[PDB]
């Protein structure tokens, strides 16, 4: 909902935000405090969550609008270079009521919430790796409320968080279908 002066965006995507460093992120803790830092890098409107995979810094170079990919073409800015960067996405999606679990292929890593809930963690780096997580539930079919970082310590990059709502059989990846920015509908 609004909860300030500032008109916001409506778009079928989740608020991206960019942000690059010279030090190292070593774990979600370290890329938070990255993000509480200062302002975004770069903003974006992330309408079709699979990125990369990539090489050579995420953070270098072009590679974040690579990595973008489709999604890119709506950055404020182009970034400078850095060492290490990542993304932080917030919005909404429409889920309806019953139990999903999301399975994520990565490098480094990430957090997905949902509804202010952890449903999909690594706390660390890694080179590409696929994780099955955990099931979680709905209770209220609508737009739930959706956040999540991901970042590159270096070298390789990927982020493709897909969803099952069918225990597991198949999954799909956030995109216009269902994402909003603000939770109305968007056209
Ligand atoms: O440790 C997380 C990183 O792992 C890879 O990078 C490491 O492993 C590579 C292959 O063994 C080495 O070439 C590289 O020097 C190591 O840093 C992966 O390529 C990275 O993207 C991960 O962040
Ligand atoms: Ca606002
Ligand atoms: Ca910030
Ligand atoms: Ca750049
Ligand atoms: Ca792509
Ligand atoms: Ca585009
Ligand atoms: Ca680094
Ligand atoms: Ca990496």
Redesign the pocket.
């Known amino acids: 909902a609004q909860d300030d002066s500032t008109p916001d965006s409506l778009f079928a995507g989740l608020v991206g935000e960019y942000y690059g460093t010279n030090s190292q992120l070593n774990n979600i803790s370290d890329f938070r405090a990255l993000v509480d830092s200062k302002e975004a890098d770069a903003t974006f409107e992330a309408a ?1 969550i ?3 995979r990539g090489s050579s810094d995420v953070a270098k170079g072009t590679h974040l609008q ?5 999604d890119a073409s709506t950055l404020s800015t182009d970034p400078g270079d850095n060492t290490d960067g990542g993304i932080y996405l917030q919005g909404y999606v429409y889920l309806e009521a019953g139990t999903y679990n999301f399975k994520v292929t990565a490098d480094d890593g990430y957090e997905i919430t949902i509804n202010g809930n952890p449903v999909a963690t690594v706390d660390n780096n890694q080179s590409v790796y696929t994780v099955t997580h955990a099931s979680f539930t709905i209770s209220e079919s609508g737009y739930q409320a959706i956040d999540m970082i991901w970042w590159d310590q270096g070298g390789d990059y990927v982020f493709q968080p897909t969803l099952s709502a069918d225990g597991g059989s198949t999954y799909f990846v956030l995109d216009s279908a269902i994402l909003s920015s603000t939770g109305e509908t968007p056209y």
Do not use: I, Q, R
């Open positions: 079709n699979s990125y990369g690579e990595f973008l990919g489709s």
